[PDB]
Symmetry: C5
Subunit: 395 residues, 5 copies
């Protein structure tokens, strides 16, 4: 238009994009800083970074960009590109990013009274400590620290406005609890002037449904399947063939486990100690099976039974469980009869060893059942906010 052309030619005249737009040079320039969270992209435990989609919001008052609407009855707002008017240098302090800015400077909207508004959208990568001790029942607290790079409290004093979470697009894997802000002042031993900053703490909770369905169920099933070894009869030559195949399947399942579990060495994740306890239980099952088989295959050369060994496994442990011419012909045939009698005596004395082995199997079944139930329940129950996690996620 004919009016906004002369207004644009008038505004930029004798204008310097390096001076702070104030009227006295001794008064602070009030900048209202806010934030708008759009979504959470990824949370990396390897490099300890947090990727979010955030729209910043800045608003200050300029003094050299004021005009009377009466002389320009068709113009109410003007827009300037990046590098033609003064802009505050507020940027993320953490900013664990390659280019460190990730801001995409857009145009700057200015009203007719000098009130300037500016909101650059970008994807930020902050650096926060991730505590993985109670994985996967953990809760994180990551900080976003904004502030001016080279302006003090007497030149550009930051103010804070509540963050906006409208249009959050829930992540699905992480659940957002809230995002409060806080303004602080840092003093140096130079000048006795404040250095204000605005920090937003993003509090988020991990969802434990995918892990509880894809890691807990197969581990519990394999651990309970490993206990069937004691139920098998020793006559079938398939006891070790099951006891070691379960362990092989656990080893191949740890391959799927590995790609998920974090590799931090600061502490021991709860899922790691749970899987290690399960693995130790399955490992000791084979040793118990080996001892039971060493007791079942009793060669007929080691007596009947030691008194100390018998008096326990057949009287006390079995009580707790409630198991419960013609002369040559005569000499030729009585030898066969006595041979059969002696073989029957040998098999009768060797049957009790098999019965003791069955008793030992039942004892080990009870002991390992209570071991695995107690370990599996206790390890998961010991974690904090477990009841809150199951109540929110599962139910």
């Amino acid at each position: 238009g004919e009016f906004q052309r002369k207004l644009y030619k008038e505004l930029v005249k004798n204008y310097n994009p390096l001076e702070r737009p104030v009227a006295n040079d001794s008064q602070p320039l009030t900048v209202y800083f806010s934030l708008s969270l759009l979504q959470i992209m990824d949370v990396d435990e390897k490099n300890q970074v947090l990727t979010t989609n955030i729209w910043l919001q800045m608003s200050w008052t300029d003094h050299y960009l004021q005009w009377n609407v009466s002389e320009y009855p068709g113009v109410k707002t003007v827009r300037f590109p990046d590098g033609q008017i003064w802009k505050p240098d507020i940027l993320l302090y953490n900013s664990a990013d390659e280019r460190f800015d990730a801001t995409f400077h857009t145009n700057v909207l200015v009203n007719s009274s000098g009130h300037c508004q500016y909101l650059p959208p970008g994807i930020f990568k902050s650096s926060c400590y991730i505590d993985v001790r109670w994985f996967p029942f953990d809760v994180q607290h990551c900080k976003l620290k904004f502030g001016s790079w080279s302006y003090g409290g007497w030149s550009l004093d930051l103010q804070m406005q509540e963050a906006d979470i409208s249009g959050y697009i829930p992540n699905g894997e992480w659940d957002l609890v809230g995002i409060p802000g806080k303004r602080s002042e840092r003093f140096y031993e130079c000048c006795k002037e404040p250095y204000p900053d605005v920090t937003f703490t993003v509090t988020m909770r991990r969802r434990t449904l995918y892990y509880g369905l894809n890691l807990l169920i197969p581990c519990v099933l394999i651990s309970a399947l490993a206990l069937l070894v004691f139920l098998l009869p020793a006559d079938s030559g398939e006891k070790i063939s099951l006891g070691i195949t379960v362990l092989l399947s656990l080893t191949v399942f740890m391959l799927l486990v590995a790609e998920i579990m974090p590799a931090t060495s600061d502490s021991v994740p709860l899922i790691a100690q749970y899987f290690a306890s399960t693995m130790i239980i399955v490992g000791l099952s084979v040793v118990v099976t080996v001892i039971v088989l060493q007791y079942h295959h009793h060669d007929p050369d080691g007596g009947k039974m030691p008194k100390w060994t018998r008096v326990i496994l057949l009287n006390w442990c079995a009580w707790f469980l409630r198991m419960k011419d013609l002369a040559k012909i005569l000499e030729e045939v009585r030898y066969i009869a006595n041979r059969f009698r002696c073989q029957d005596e040998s098999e009768a004395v060797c049957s009790e060893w098999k019965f003791a082995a069955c008793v030992v199997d039942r004892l080990c079944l009870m002991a390992f059942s209570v071991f695995t139930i107690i370990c599996t329940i206790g390890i998961l129950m010991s974690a904090p906010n477990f009841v809150e996690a199951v109540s929110k996620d599962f139910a």
Copy 2:
């Protein structure tokens, strides 16, 4: 040429690339916005982003770029680079991209009557919720929201033209249903002026052929192979050796399953519950086998059979299935005869236990056959648009 040189020297004189090219400053500038879809690149369920190849199309009318063709009888169109003439700032609102623009500003074609045309090609990355509850029989609805960044409805009012799908280059994995557009207006509690926008909804359907050939076939084959355990005779010492090897193969197959299934914790995908049901069936087969083997290896010390146990497995379940001097010589030889008689009696009483075990095996075969058929059919049939998916993809 001698004429277009002076025309170029004439057009840019007293021209400002920051003013909106209108003649009254109070009338809106009509901008016709369209879209051209070229292909769909990827659909990421991890970060919930959509990558597409899109050619935008913009068209407005300028006022300071008009010239009479008679004075320039060799020039009909002129082209200006980026940053020399006014261009609308229409850009994607979602734009889950690193640089947020991905536009590649090209030249701007202008006719001799001021009609300007401009179409920048680029690859866009929108952010949409992906609902994976019915994976792999799901249908998605992703939105592309375009609009002016800093112009109101009284300055730059958007119009919509139907999107073009000519030259679509079908993806192969995702099937496009359509892409309709809609223009909406958003009001603020400041000014009572519209803020128009143009949004395009991309509706696409997943193709279920690769999954139905590479995941369903091996799982069905393994599940049906696990049922052969009951058909085996108990004499061969190879029953557990098959029952647990099938489970080991299922565990190693879950490794291939894992890289495909999504990791979202918002809901349970249908393929996950189908594979979990198959795994539970294969797991319980081993427990049934253990009980059957515990019944086959009956030691000759526990009586013939309890009446309650016998009267079922041999009379009712077997009816439903329709299974159906010389004194010393005499004393020495009659002992052998009676020993043989007693051993034959013992083996005769122990044969019925094996027959009961065979009956139990047949019952478990029937029960597990109907269990696996019902589960496999029901889980897949319960999903919506399943008949549409199979009719379009397979047939």
Copy 3:
């Protein structure tokens, strides 16, 4: 030098880098477009893109860059950077690239008669459909479509020169057949003027040596190893232990298979149906083995043999294969004799079941040998250009 300084100061005077360098403004500017292929980088079936190393070649005639050599007896050529002289905007239409250009604008060489030459080197990413139906015996046809972005046929008319393949640096995985070009004209219903373009079709053939050595050999070996089950004698309790271990090895081999086979759902690759047929054969071997073992372990309670079952497996199938006081003493000893006689009769009647099982094993060996030979030969032979692929690659 003293002369080229004044020549450079003379050429750029009153020069506009936006005007088309012609002398009448109504005559087309002839631009000769060529191409030089250096190597093929990658062919992606996931996103359907093609990455190549290409050196474009452009050549046109300028009019404002002419000088007489006599007045400058030391200067014959001059070079201008990007953005100081007019350059055609020829660029790839497909260009499935992030920045869409990938050109690296170099200097522009100009002769003393105005003949300008310019060749920018870059790495291009085109988008072409990849048909994977006959994988790995497939042949592709990918297109590279070049043309002016905003110039018509009456302003900038493209000409085509044959592509150069000198210095091709063969890929090793893909074999190049050729690269012919073609110039076409597209008409619009506006102006009745041509819109010329130049397109190059890159025809390439996949090399089938790595696949034929790393996928076909192990699959054939495993499939032929699975047939040894029928050769084993039934006395050894190791028949299922081999039949199911072969299947477990096939399942773990499919993990290596998975990372190679494409994931397109448009059609069924030939390697997928070949591996599926092999897997189905190995699966049915176990069912046949289960039936054979169910026939070998015949309990002595089911008669001798049904007439219909016997008359086939022992007369017809066996013919086709060409298998082929003292009273008490007497009562006490004749009982033992008759017991031995009856046990011998029972074992004699039970031997024929084992012989029938051996006959069934031989029949199944022949049937499965011909099944696997026919399937393996037919699936590979059915593909087109198979004889050409083996003749070129292997021999």
Copy 4:
């Protein structure tokens, strides 16, 4: 403000951003260089690079940027963007980075007395040798070498200030020992002038908790589980079925091992030789088992025992371990009696072979127990700073 506008218009007048800001041109310009470490991102053994988050700090004195505060009673500091005032070109010499700079030039703060301050934040990628001989008990020494690119010691002489480690955000995987600095001078055979530089040596120690819990525990468990083979009785046909299944599980565990262990060929990592020793032990267990089984299944055709073989395994090795009409009737019945007697003699002579096999099993159990204990303890104990690593990490 009205004063800082004229101050900005005054400072840049007759100013050249290419001249070194001194007053005599023969005196060096003192530049104080420091460093601030924020975190360690990654340590790559593949390409031998180190990624860190570092905030440089530079401080020099300018001469043309001095003004009197009395004439500008509202201005105390001024800020200039990149490219408007002279800045030193100090940059990382190693800088194994794509763009080689990674600096993100910010504004430059200047006091009223000419004292200029400038601190650019960025992510650096240095190149250092990583010695992996004692993995995972290794300690590294990576260098960061800073210095001027094109200024000598008589123009820009570097000074060093102690690095700051406040706000270190511990990595979790690598433990920082310290970061001392040093200033050195390099002389050339041209000019006899120093070329100063500032180098910082980052000393870090690897944390051995994740490896000690996820690699040592399963390997020790599998190695000790492989020793149960000797404890098994030979009657059960399951000895090889365990001895080879343990080896199969070790082979599948090496897959998880592979993704962690480095691929450098300069030396042999300690974890590689430990896992190789474990694998060799498990391999030789099967050969010992094969020999034991070849001794257990003694066919009754090879005599009783060779004297040299017997006199050891039953007298010395067993002492060290402390194992410890009527004529036809008579001819018909005495033959049966003698046949039974001869069969009993044969089984009695064949029992001693089984006893010798048990003795051999016990000897091999003791020998392999001491072998595996000595190897496992010695390999880990031989590494340096092992006691320091366990004392700091575990306890």
Copy 5:
């Protein structure tokens, strides 16, 4: 300073950064090109690219940048940024890079006599053929071809200086042999003028320690472990259970093999044929075992032995190996005696089949031992420079 300010204001006056800085325009400008190698980053066999860290070195003589030191007694060198003085356009011809330059133009140092020096550091990505026929005992020859983009031999003639390898930071995986240079001239059929270039050939040798410890050792161990099958006695039902478990472990080991071996189809790598020979040997072991077991389980219905079969396996092959009233009572008891006699005859005739099976096992052990020794030694020894590789790497 006061002098260098006027010197900088004097040098750039009437200066053009596009003219070649000579004094006659007909004389070539001598440019001395060198190179400095810092390290080798990666060698990719997939795309056939080579990534190196290289510092170029250029040096020419300018004519318009000369000043007398007496008039400027404080200035000896001046520095100009990129784009203010003329620089040669020497760049890598291969340059298989995205941006094709990767140079990071730094400042240009100039002496007081016009001697200009310039060395830009960068990371280059060349494209060279990698011959992988003798993997992992291969030696490569990759070329780096530098030259002027648009200057002939009569304008800018290149000279070559020997490359510098001081500070090489050895890679660890690749061993550098040397890097010689060569200057060549290319003539066109236009002008009869040279087009000089400078090319450096990087010769490097692969280190075979990691492969020789992580691939050769497990393959040899598994191959030698597979031979124990023949040593086992046939009485134990565990022969196939070992023969097929070894093959399963080999199949799972090929998964680790796959990620390392290249995927080029140009030729067959030596490691591929070695692993294939090992796999074929292990495969044929199972077939031999099946035949041996088919000979061990001889049913008592097929005669004693065919003469041709016996006369070899028991006379020749066993010689080469040096294996070596009362009437009813009488009728009732003589039947039992004759039954025992006939059963003893049957077992005596069936023992020789087992002995022949043992002889066959020993023959197959010898044959397969020599097969595997010859194959394993020959395949590795056939490669060139094998003795050099082992002498340098291992010893």
